[PDB]
Amino acid sequence: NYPAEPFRIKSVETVSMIPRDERLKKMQEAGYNTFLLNSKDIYIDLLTDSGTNAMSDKQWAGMMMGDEAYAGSENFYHLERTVQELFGFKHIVPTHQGRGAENLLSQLAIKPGQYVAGNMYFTTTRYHQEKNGAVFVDIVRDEAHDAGLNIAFKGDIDLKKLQKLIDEKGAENIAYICLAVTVNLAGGQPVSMANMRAVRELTEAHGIKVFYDATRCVENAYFIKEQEQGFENKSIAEIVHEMFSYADGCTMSGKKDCLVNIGGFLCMNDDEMFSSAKELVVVYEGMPSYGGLAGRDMEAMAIGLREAMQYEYIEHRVKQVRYLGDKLKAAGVPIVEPVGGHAVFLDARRFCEHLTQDEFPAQSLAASIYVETGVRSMERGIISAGRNNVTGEHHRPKLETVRLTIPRRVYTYAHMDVVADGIIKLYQHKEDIRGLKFIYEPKQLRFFTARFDYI
Amino acid sequence: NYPAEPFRIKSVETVSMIPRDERLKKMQEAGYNTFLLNSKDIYIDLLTDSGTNAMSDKQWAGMMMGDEAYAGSENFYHLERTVQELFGFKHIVPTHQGRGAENLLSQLAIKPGQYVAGNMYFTTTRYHQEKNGAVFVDIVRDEAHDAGLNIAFKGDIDLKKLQKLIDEKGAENIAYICLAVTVNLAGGQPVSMANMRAVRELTEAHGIKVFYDATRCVENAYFIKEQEQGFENKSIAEIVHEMFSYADGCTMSGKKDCLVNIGGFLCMNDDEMFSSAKELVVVYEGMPSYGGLAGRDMEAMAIGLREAMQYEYIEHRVKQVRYLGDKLKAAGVPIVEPVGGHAVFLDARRFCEHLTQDEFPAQSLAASIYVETGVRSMERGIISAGRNNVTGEHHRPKLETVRLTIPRRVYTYAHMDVVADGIIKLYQHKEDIRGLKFIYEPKQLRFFTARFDYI
Amino acid sequence: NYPAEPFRIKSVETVSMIPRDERLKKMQEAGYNTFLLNSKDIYIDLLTDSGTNAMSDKQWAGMMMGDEAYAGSENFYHLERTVQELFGFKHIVPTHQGRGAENLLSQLAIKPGQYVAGNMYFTTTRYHQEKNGAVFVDIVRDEAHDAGLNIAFKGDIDLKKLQKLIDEKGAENIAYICLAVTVNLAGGQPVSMANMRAVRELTEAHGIKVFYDATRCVENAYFIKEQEQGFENKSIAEIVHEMFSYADGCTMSGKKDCLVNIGGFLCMNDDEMFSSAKELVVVYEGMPSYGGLAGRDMEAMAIGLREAMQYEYIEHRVKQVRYLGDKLKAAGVPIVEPVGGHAVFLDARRFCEHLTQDEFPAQSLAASIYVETGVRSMERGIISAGRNNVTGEHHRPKLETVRLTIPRRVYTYAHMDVVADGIIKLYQHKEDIRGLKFIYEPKQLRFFTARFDYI
Amino acid sequence: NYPAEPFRIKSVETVSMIPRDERLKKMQEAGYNTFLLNSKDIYIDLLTDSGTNAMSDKQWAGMMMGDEAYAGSENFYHLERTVQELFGFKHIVPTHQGRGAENLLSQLAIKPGQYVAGNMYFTTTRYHQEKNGAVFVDIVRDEAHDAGLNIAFKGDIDLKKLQKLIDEKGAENIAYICLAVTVNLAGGQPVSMANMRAVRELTEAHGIKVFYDATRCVENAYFIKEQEQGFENKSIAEIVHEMFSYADGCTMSGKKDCLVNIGGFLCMNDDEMFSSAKELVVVYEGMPSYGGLAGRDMEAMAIGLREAMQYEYIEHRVKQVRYLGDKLKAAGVPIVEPVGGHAVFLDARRFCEHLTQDEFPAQSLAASIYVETGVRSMERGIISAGRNNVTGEHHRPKLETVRLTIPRRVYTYAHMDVVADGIIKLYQHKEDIRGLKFIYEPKQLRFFTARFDYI
Ligand SMILES: CC1=C(O)/C(=C\N=C(/C)C(=O)O)C(COP(=O)(O)O)=CN1
Ligand SMILES: CC1=C(O)/C(=C\N=C(/C)C(=O)O)C(COP(=O)(O)O)=CN1
Ligand SMILES: *Cc1c(COP(=O)(O)O)cnc(C)c1O
Ligand SMILES: *Cc1c(COP(=O)(O)O)cnc(C)c1O
Ligand SMILES: [K+]
Ligand SMILES: [K+]
Ligand SMILES: [K+]
Ligand SMILES: [K+]
């Protein structure tokens, strides 16, 4: 139901709240973009679960054994064998974080004019696909875009859609299939093993490569153990190893499920791709033997990935998120269902039904939540979706959401109650939330530093 | 009612989640004595609040700045000015922990045959008084000995007993009044500011010295802020400083309210005594400027004592313990009342009223609690009382209790639920709890290494 | 002559002391390529001064205060004001290390077909310039290419070459002047303040921008204090600030002169460029307020850059390298002159004049040095130069060298003796050094993984 | 001859010097007692090698795995088995440092009226012997008191003197033999294995117990390997294990040869003594399961004791001291010979032959060395020797020395040169050093806080 933390607290950092009118000042100073608030002016920081995790005593012991050598570091060897063992891939190239590996994959595996197909888009991923000359095709099933629809494994690829893509475009014009676990923008929704196996069989028969976005693969494995028939007695590690046996490689932002504050990598089975990846890694990241990471960080990430395989750890991680979701839902607050692995997503269309999606309800709601509570959350809606690179119009995602994203091992159920209590009160006067409009818009990944003014 | 943690987690400590059946085997291998359990086999360790506290990020930063010089360390000067500022004593001598400071005080301040009077007593404190030739006299209010009596400031000294001691023995034959805040043996009960002032004035008129056992002075200050009228507008720090203005000095276990794992100190206002204390500290502890502590530890203790002044921190510390007591009591589980600053004491006599004291109900209840929940608690009953080696009979204490002792900043309300729910479930079939018999009993310190089996 | 270390040791790093016979086996298992040695098998690792620096106690304290927020981290603001104060640039964008900042600069500041001119070049820097469409032009003084010429400020730009470039191509077709301090490829040679000013004035009159590669700017400032007249009364910090007042911005590898294991940044004065840089940093690195670094690492870099301003620190850093060069040279061992800020380069062509370049004298000398002393050095000769894949011929560089690269604050003069004495002993029977032949050669990055055997 | 450091520097702490007249001020403010100077006013701190050692990366990794439990800590178990394995004793009781264990031993093993016999006195040791009712008898051979006499194993007990003590006093009036390795006050002089074996045989035949002071046992083992015939091929660990096979237990200040900043212990073979020691440890130090130490400190000390067994580490440690000695001797500076394991001792009788021992030449010289160099050193002469507890006169040691004591793994040969250069210059005008007299004298261990004025 709701287990207690399967760990003790080793050290703490203080949290405080500043008055509402200070927060009012700060929200306008930040152009009503939560990304532009300062860390010290935030009481509970749920902007993202990326890089904000609490490390363990063992990882910190690893941090003291940083072998900082340029090549041949013990830390690189430990990371390399851990990832080979746990994920089952032949080769690994470390990168400083996820988008570093996406930069490598996209340059390596895409010829201009080709299609990349994925189970829903992601921001940095789609940007790197498109700047290397690819058209992104969404092949997640329709249901994944229906916020309130409570079905299991919403992250699953629609096989019918993949078949269609192959018939219409021809297999040789498909660069690869991008399969993310979990699917972040659908609300952290898992992909079933049955689906990964079917995708593999179908792509293999046409000679098409499959690369996983491994960023939240452990959360995903937890959902498989919990809900997919025949997996209830398998270990998280067994499930993780089987997942990747259906892929040709993966990108990974270790800043999520490897339980670290920095770090990532690219894996692949193909020797020639590994060669080419090492050539490129030196341009952007570092030598293949550290990839833009300190030795101590390769060590922390090797230790953290293995810790993530502990059943009680990942069960608690996921059920803590589910608790926040359960509380919000019992009070009538509209959310994406079912609750995903890493965050609760308020459905901004419903929270603010008096605004149109063109008035940026999600961006607005996130600002309002900050002003009323000091809790920081992130826009995951029309602003994040960016512009159509052909028409210049906003991409218009059906999912217009605001994310309360939970860092791993950082907060308690009492913090979840405080967050829930605040959101619930904002709900009582949701009609008070105003439309926003751009006053400054970056040319790509605009959500990061865009500024707004009230309409 | 109960506040959320006024901090978040910076790092975690790894623990074992072994299941009940395996816990039963560890309990058996430990001869049903919780003092013999391995730390690595315990989920939640409530054996003691001494030196088991979680430090902050700021303390851990000070841990990296240990000036390890044998004399004149910068860390000692930081510690020194912090305690002068916050306690308002003229002089300070660091010691490795509390009983090191007690050793010094009792040697400095007692002539053979003299009396030391206090509000109840603690084992190490009273030991050092007696081996320097003092006779102990309990001058706590009589209410403190009624363990079920729910009244405020139960730790207060009975001014009439103090007067009576003075009239009967003479002021010149009283070494000092030892006033402890809070009072451990009464279950962590606080002492009021009015009481501290009344005692200062009576003792001062007769030339008698007063030394505080300041080990949980911050918990004590929280009770005064919360319950003593006139202190609603005072900061914890103002209250702490006023408390000590009524003393000639103090002994301190930093391992409790200074939020550290090791450390303590001795304070006094008198120049001549400070001189004598520096002559003696070098005998047992170290220099006046390290006192048996590493430089990093004087630094962590200087930083920890200042953090302990934060209202929200100590409010949450005391209310978290109170939460555990309230929950037990609402289900009819018998406890010492009112709940103290640092622990909850189960009344094992009443909990296991089908067992006689000779069947060690507290020792047996402590073993049951570990088996059922992974929680370690401390026996504080007939076993810890020891055996009269002259007559061979048990010392038979009036309190037959299990102590649930709460380290600062280590656990959450969900851990408190694990503890409460498990004890509550045992309470519902309390008649099934079995008596214990010795299978190995040493001559001394029997509570530390004795082994038992079920009757 | 040579100052003592202006610091003492706070903690040590454990190394293997394996004997010569065992070192011969590790060298053989590594195919006689020092780049393939395991860090755990190396006594003294002079492969590189990049990211291998020892941090202080203060830096390690900042490592405990990482504010890991995704945006608005306190550590970023500390880094930001430190670089503004010390470099005197208006704006700063952090990057995970140097080549991340170079990626950004070259994309922001180059239109296809434009020229970038600099005092020699570095591989990553020049790569990013060229892939954004620039043509590189070397405008260093001709003396810089005479590797045995013992003159001051060998890194200076030839103003006449700059003028000639301007006259021939037009100012509008020059993207920027890339001025590096120190100049790595000339062996770590400094650039004078007069040169920096002369270049600022000529470029400014034509509207041309100047960006510094500031990677070893502090070593450079030490040379100006020591050798450029008029700077005897200036602090290292005054000199560093004046250097940058002659630039429009810079790229920085903190892994060199900021005394850290990871980290770098981009600076500029121009508001519009700062805006564009923040639009791009999110593509490859992270937010304008972490740039692909953990919060603790921005903190360590802010603290390290300020420590690097201490005169005694940088004096000792540069004179320790000089000590190694002086000792080699006094025994007749041929080196690049004068000795630079960060390394000594052995002339392997002259050292092994019984071998032809096709027998890889630098690669072989590097292997010998490890076998005889436990010291790892880097090949910087025909092997690192790579192979023309069009014609299949070696690129044949004029410099056939072994680089003895000195990390900051890691080694003592006795380690420098181990290195010198071992090289000196090899020099005395240099004729016994054997040529190498490939037994495995990859198509690219051949210096990283190639294996050899003796001829 | 002089090996290089068999480790790299992992982190540093800054050192600086203040002007001579600031130092002049500071020396008089400190009553001309070097113990009373502040750490931050000292440039190179050679007061003592106790607790001032640099820890390794592995020890600091152990520091992150502090298991702070009150009983059953993993850290206590690791310390316990390491000491059982390496020293060979049956039982261990941790204490916060050396004099804590001496306090226990003296209370446990001495009946009033009995004699304790040792190879030369030590300050805290003799004080704890005498306050428990023992007469100290020196049975080191005469030669150990002759400063300039260069003979091997000066720490050896004179068997003739031990035999005499037994005949004159009777074996049952001898509490135990105290055998220290090395002998600190003779200048850090080693004891031979032959001598330890002869002492064991002779004491065993009379039923007399032998307890070692293990504080510098690893330095001692190094001297045996280097100089005692038949031990040249034994490992340091084998030699350490054999040493202790001749003892009934030991006291240990881990702050020396266990390479830590705090910590110690008491070992013994006898079960009944172990029982009694645990009873006493709770009075002064803590529970037998932590002994006044944080878990992380038991861990660091377990790791450090094992590191100390590495041949190259202890060889370098000892030869670095020998280098300082060689330099001083080549210049004609008078020292204790041969040079011991941990410090060079200037012979103050010879350095200041114009003063009498009653004018405290050693105390004076130490002050002078500070004023001229900023180097701190310690009095080891008439002041340290204390007063005869029968006559009230100063004990008058023949050895009137000033100690330049080297912390482990903290300084370099260049620091040793700076120290040597300074001492050598002070020597040129040694006639300038003035007599001192007490203005304040503590009643015991007076050297710690005594203050003086020039005669
Ligand atoms: C599924 C997925 C992500 O969610 C992702 C970054 N997402 C963030 C930081 C988030 O807040 O969701 C990235 C990019 O990783 P990076 O932030 O560059 O380490 C890749 N995959
Ligand atoms: C041989 C020996 C010592 O040298 C010693 C303390 N000596 C110090 C601190 C010194 O500076 O020599 C002690 C007392 O240890 P302690 O400083 O209490 O950990 C015991 N034995
Ligand atoms: C624990 C305690 C002490 C002793 O302090 P230590 O640091 O354990 O020696 C003294 N007084 C009270 C009231 C205590 O609880
Ligand atoms: C090492 C170096 C760089 C690159 O920095 P990284 O942090 O290695 O990417 C750039 N310029 C010079 C002169 C360098 O030496
Ligand atoms: K982070
Ligand atoms: K502890
Ligand atoms: K590094
Ligand atoms: K110390």
What residue type is assigned to position C84 of the chain?
Answer: Q
Distance separating the N- and C-terminal Cα atoms of chain B: 43
User: Listing from the earlier edge strand, what are the strands of the sheet with A55-56?
Assistant: A55-56, B7-13, A8-14, B55-56
- CATH number of the domain where residue D415 is located: 3.90.1150.10
Ligand nearest to the CA of A96: 1
Classify residue C429 as exposed, middle or buried by CB count within 10 Å of its CB (0-12, 13-18, 19+). Answer: exposed
Report the distance separating Cα C393 and Cα C387, nearest Å: 6
Residue C448 forms contact with A (CB below 8 Å): yes
What string of H, E and C letters represents the secondary structure of chain B? CCCCCCEEEEEEECCCCCCHHHHHHHHHHCCCCHHHCCHHHCCEECCCCCCCCCEEHHHHHHHCCCCCCCCCCHHHHHHHHHHHHHHCCCEEEEECCHHHHHHHHHHHHCCCCCEEEECCCCHHHHHHHHHCCCEEEECECHHHHCCCCCCCCCCCECHHHHHHHHHHHCHHHEEEEEEECCEHHHCCECCCHHHHHHHHHHHHHCCCEEEEECCCHHHHHHHHHHHCCCCCCCCHHHHHHHHHCCCCEEEEECCCCCCCCCCEEEEECCHHHHHHHHHHHHHHCCCCCCCCCCHHHHHHHHHHHHHCCCHHHHHHHHHHHHHHHHHHHHCCCCECCCCCCCEEEEEHHHHCCCCCHHHCHHHHHHHHHHHHHCEECEEECHHHHCECCCCCCECCCCCCEEEEECCCCCCCHHHHHHHHHHHHHHHHCHHHCCCEEEEECCCCCHHHHCEEEEC
> CB contact, 8 Å: C58 with chain B?
yes
Edge-to-edge strand list for the sheet holding C343-347 = C343-347, C401-405, C378-380
The closest residue, in CA terms, to atom 15 on ligand 2 is: D98
Name the closest-CA residue to atom 2, ligand 1. A215
DSSP letter assigned to residue A232: T
Residues of C in contact with A128 (CB under 8 A): 283
Q: How far is CA C163 from the centre of its chain?
A: 28
DSSP string, A28-70: HHTTT-GGGS-GGG-SEE-S-SSS-PPEEHHHHHHHTT----S
Record the resolution, in angstroms.
2.2
Structure tokens belonging to residue B271: 């120049």
**Residue whose structure tokens are 């000529």:** C202
Please report, as a single letter, which amino acid is at residue C16. S
Task: Give burial (CB, 10 Å; 0-12/13-18/19+) of D233.
Answer: exposed
Between C57, C58, C65, which is nearest B57 by CB? C65
Burial class (CB in 10 A: 0-12, 13-18, 19+), D95: buried
How far apart CA C117 and CA C215 sit, in angstroms, is: 18
Distance of CA D61 to the CA centre of its chain: 27
Do B30 and B81 belong to one domain?
no
User: Which atom number of ligand 3 is nearest to the Cα of residue B50?
Assistant: 1
φ/ψ (deg, to 5) at B117 = -115, 145
Q: What was the structure determination method? A: X-ray
Q: Which residue of D has its CA nearest to C312?
A: D16
Q: Residue A172 gets which letter from DSSP?
A: G
State the Cα–Cα distance between residues B147 and B187, nearest whole angstrom. 8
Please give the structure tokens belonging to residue A83.
Answer: 């990832």
> Does A50 sit in the ligand 1 pocket, CB within 6 Å?
yes
Tell me A8's DSSP state.
E
Residues spanned by the domain of A437: 1-56+310-454
Contact D249, D269 (CB under 8 A): yes
Q: Which of B191, B256, B265 to mutate to test the pocket of ligand 3 (most atoms within 8 A of CB)?
A: B256
Cβ proximity of D141 and D199 under 8 Å: no
What are the two backbone dihedrals, phi and then psi, of residue B96, each rounded to the nearest 5 degrees? -70, -30
Distance between CA D54 and CA C8 in Å, rounded? 9
Question: How far lies B349's CA from each of B423, C297, D169, D307, in Å?
Answer: 15, 56, 58, 52
**Six token digits for residue C120:** 């020699």
Which of D32, D43, D122, D345 is the catalytic position?
D122
Show Cβ contacts of residue B392 under 8 Å, excluding neighbours closer than 6 positions. Answer: none
Q: Alpha carbon of C292 to those of A250, A445, C66, C280: distances in Å?
A: 20, 16, 14, 13
D68 touches chain A (CB under 8 A): no
- Ligand 1, atom 17: nearest CA belongs to which residue? A98
- Structural contact between residues C27 and C442, judged by C-beta atoms closer than 8 angstroms: no
**Tokens at residue D444, please?**
């015991």
Q: Which atom of ligand 2 is nearest to the CA of D255?
A: 19
d(CA A436, CA A363): 8
Paired with D437 in beta bridges are D453
Computed from CA positions of residues B145, B149, B154, B158, in that sequence, does the dihedral angle turn out positive or negative? negative
Residue A124 burial by CB count (10 A; 0-12/13-18/19+): exposed, middle or buried? Answer: buried
Nearest to B414 by CA among B52, B72, B9: B9
Q: Which mutation among B50, B218, B219 tests ligand 3's pocket best, with the greatest number of atoms within 8 A of CB?
A: B50
Query: Which one of A45, A156, A213, A297 is the catalytic residue?
Result: A213
Closest C-alpha to D254, from D299, D321, D310, D188: D299
Enter the tokens of residue D156: 């050896």
Quote the ligand 7 centre to B207 CA distance (angstroms): 66
Task: Return all residues near A380 (Cβ < 8 A) that are at least 6 apart.
Answer: A185, A345, A362, A399, A401, A402, A403
Kindly report whether the peptide bond that precedes residue C203 is cis, defined as omega within 30 degrees of 0: no
Binding site membership of A180 for ligand 1 (Cβ less than 6 Å): yes
What is the C-alpha separation between B35 and B454, in angstroms, rounded?
Answer: 17
Domain with residue B89: its CATH number is 3.40.640.10
Handedness of CA A315, A321, A325, A327 (dihedral sign): positive
Q: Which amino acid is at C417?
A: D
Of all protein residues, the one whose alpha carbon is nearest to atom 2 of ligand 2 is D215
Alpha-carbon Rg for chain D, nearest whole angstrom, is 21
Put simply, whether C35 touches A (Cβ < 8 Å) is yes
Nearest to C422 by CA among C8, C20, C9: C20
Is residue B396 domain-shared with residue B443, that is, in the same domain? yes
| Whether the Cβ atoms of residue B301 and residue B395 lie closer than 8 Å to each other | no
CA distance C95 to C252: 9
Q: Which regions of D183-239 does DSSP assign to beta strands (E)?
A: 210-213
Q: Are A11 and B55 a contacting pair at CB < 8 A?
A: yes
Determine whether A28 is exposed, middle or buried from the number of CB atoms within 10 Å of its CB (0-12, 13-18, 19+). Answer: middle
Amino acid residing at C249: G
Residues of C in contact with B58 (CB under 8 A): 65
Same domain, A304 and A314: no
Catalytic residue check, D123: yes
How is residue D446 annotated by DSSP? G
Residue whose tokens read 């070893």: C216
DSSP D436: E
**A125 and A261, same structural domain?**
yes
Contact across the interface for C14 and D57, Cβ inside 8 Å:
yes
Three-class SS of residue D193?
A: helix
Task: Give the rounded distance of the alpha carbon of D364 from its chain centre.
Answer: 22
Give me B19's structure tokens: 């299941």
Does the beta carbon of B184 sit less than 6 angstroms from any atom of ligand 3?
yes
Q: Which residue has the tokens 């006599």?
A: B349
Select from D309, D334, D353 the last residue of a domain: D309
Tokens linked to C347: 């002339």
Q: Report the C-alpha gap between B406 and B320 in whole angstroms.
A: 9
User: Which residue in C169, C174, C177 sits closest to C201, CA to CA?
Assistant: C177
Bond preceding residue C338 cis, omega within 30 of 0? yes
User: How many angstroms is it from A4 CA to the middle of ligand 1?
Assistant: 28
Closest alpha carbon to C227 in C324, C129, C318: C318
> Residue A369 and residue A46: Cα distance in Å, rounded?
11
A322 is catalytic: no
Do residues A202 and A174 share a domain?
yes
Whole-number Cα distances in Å, C432 to C30, C425, C427: 21, 12, 10
Report how far residue D9's alpha carbon sits from residue D115's, in angstroms, rounded to the nearest whole number.
47
SS (H, E, C) A244-257: HCCCCEEEEECCCC
- Who surrounds ion ligand 6 at CB < 5 A? B 51, 261; D 68, 294
> Which 3-state string (H, E, C) describes chain C?
CCCCCCEEEEEEECCCCCCHHHHHHHHHHCCCCHHHCCHHHCCEECCCCCCCCCEEHHHHHHHCCCCCCCCCCHHHHHHHHHHHHHHCCCEEEEECCHHHHHHHHHHHHCCCCCEEEECCCCHHHHHHHHHCCCEEEECECHHHHCCCCCCCCCCCECHHHHHHHHHHHCHHHEEEEEEECCEHHHCCECCCHHHHHHHHHHHHHCCCEEEEECCCHHHHHHHHHHHCCCCCCCCHHHHHHHHHCCCCEEEEECCCCCCCCCCEEEEECCHHHHHHHHHHHHHHCCCCCCCCCCHHHHHHHHHHHHHCCCHHHHHHHHHHHHHHHHHHHHCCCCECCCCCCCEEEEEHHHHCCCCCHHHCHHHHHHHHHHHHHCEECEEECHHHHCECCCCCCECCCCCCEEEEECCCCCCCHHHHHHHHHHHHHHHHCHHHCCCEEEEECCCCCHHHHCEEEEC
Place of tokens 């015991």: D444
Interface of A with D in 345-374 (CB under 8 A): none
Q: Which amino acid, one-letter code, is at C350?
A: R
Residue B251, Cα to own-chain centre: how many angstroms?
13
Q: Which of B284, B309, B334 is the last residue of a domain?
A: B309
* B62 chain-C contacts, CB cut-off 8 A: 61
Residues 6+ apart with CB under 8 A from C173: C113, C114, C115
**Residue B204 φ/ψ, nearest 5 degrees:** -65, -35
Tell me, letter by letter, the H, E, C secondary structure of C186-220: HCCECCCHHHHHHHHHHHHHCCCEEEEECCCHHHH
Burial of C154 by CB count in 10 Å (0-12 exposed, 13-18 middle, 19+ buried)? buried
Residues 172-231 of C with CB under 8 A from B: none
Q: Which of these is catalytic: D23, D225, D255, D256? A: D256
DSSP state letter for D400: -
Residues of chain B found within 8 Å of residue A415, distances taken between Cβ atoms: 4-5, 8
Interchain CB contacts (distance < 8 Å): B and D: 148
**What residues have their beta carbon closer than 5 A to ion ligand 8?**
B 68, 294; D 51, 261
Q: Are A24 and B19 in contact (CB under 8 A)?
A: no
Q: Which ligand is nearest to the CA of B220?
A: 3
Pair A445, A124: CB distance under 8 Å: yes
Q: Is B121 left (phi over 0), alpha (psi -120 to 50) or beta?
A: beta
B142, B399, B400 from B396: Cα distances, Å:
20, 9, 9
Residue A142 and residue A195 in one domain: yes
Could you tell me if B353 and B373 are in contact, meaning their C-beta atoms sit under 8 angstroms apart? no
Taking the alpha carbons at both ends of chain C, their separation in whole angstroms is: 43
Residue A224 sits in the same domain as residue A149: yes
**Beta-bridge partners for D92:** D267
Rounded Cα–Cα distance for residues C28 and C38 (Å): 12
Query: D307-318 b/e with 16+ CB inside 10 Å = b?
Result: bbbbeebbbbbb
C122 shares its domain with C256: yes
Active-site annotation holds for C123: yes
Residues B205, B332 share a domain: no
B292 touches ligand 3 (CB under 6 Å): no
- CA A60, distance to chain mean position in Å, is 24
User: What is the distance between the alpha carbons of residues D105 and D250, in angstroms, rounded to a whole number?
Assistant: 9
Residue written as tokens 């990553």?
C124
Q: Identify the domain boundary among B265, B291, B309.
A: B309
**Segment D239-242 long-range contacts (CB within 8 Å, at least 24 positions apart):** D239/D193, D240/D86, D240/D87, D240/D309, D241/D86, D241/D87, D241/D88, D242/D193
SS3 D105: helix
The answer to whether residues D7 and D313 touch, using CB atoms and an 8 Å cutoff, is: yes
C166 in the same domain as C75: yes
Sign of CA dihedral A230, A234, A238, A244: positive
CA atoms within a 13 Å half-sphere pointing along the CA-CB vector of A208: 27
Greatest C-alpha distance within chain A: 62
Residues 6+ apart with CB under 8 A from B231: B193, B224, B225, B239
- Among B58, B32, B31, B34, which Cα is nearest to B44's? B34
Say yes or no: D365 and D389 in one domain: yes
- Please identify which residue in the block is written with the tokens 């400070």: B274
| Domain count for chain D | 2
Distance of alpha carbon B429 from alpha carbon A338, whole angstroms? 39
Helix axes A123-131, C271-284, angle to 10 degrees: 100
**Do residues C409 and C259 touch, judged by C-beta distance below 8 A?**
yes
Residue ranges lining ligand 4, Cβ < 6 Å: C 50, 97-99, 122, 124-125, 180, 184, 213, 215, 253, 255, 264
Cβ atoms < 10 Å from Cβ of D143 = 15
Torsion of CA C180, C186, C187, C190, to 10 degrees: -50
Residue of C nearest to A68 (CA): C52
B60 touches chain A (CB under 8 A): yes
Out of D211, D213, D218, D253, mutate this one to test ligand 2's pocket (max ligand atoms within 8 Å of CB): namely: D253
The answer to whether the Cα torsion of A135, A131, A101, C442 is positive or negative is positive
Give me B174's structure tokens.
């009283």
Rounded CA separation B134/B174 (Å): 9
Is C416 buried (19+), middle (13-18) or exposed (0-12) by CB count in 10 A? buried
Does the active-site annotation cover A14? no
Instruction: Give every CB contact of residue A436 below 8 A, 6+ residues apart in sequence.
Output: A32, A359, A360, A363, A364, A367, A452, A453, A454, A455
Which residues in chain A are contacts of D60 at CB distance < 8 A? 64
Point out the ligand nearest to the CA of residue C262: 7
- Give residue for tokens 């060669």: A275
Q: Could you say which DSSP state residue A390 is in?
A: T
Contacts of A208 (CB under 8 A, 6+ apart): A166, A171, A174, A176, A177
Which residue from C343, C445, C441, C442 is spatially nearest to C399, judged by alpha carbons?
Answer: C343
Q: How far apart are CA C173 and CA C95, in angstroms?
A: 28
**Residue ID of nearest Cα to ligand 1 atom 12:** A48
Nearest to C14 by CA among D259, B70, B294: D259
Residue D300 shares a structural domain with residue D387: no
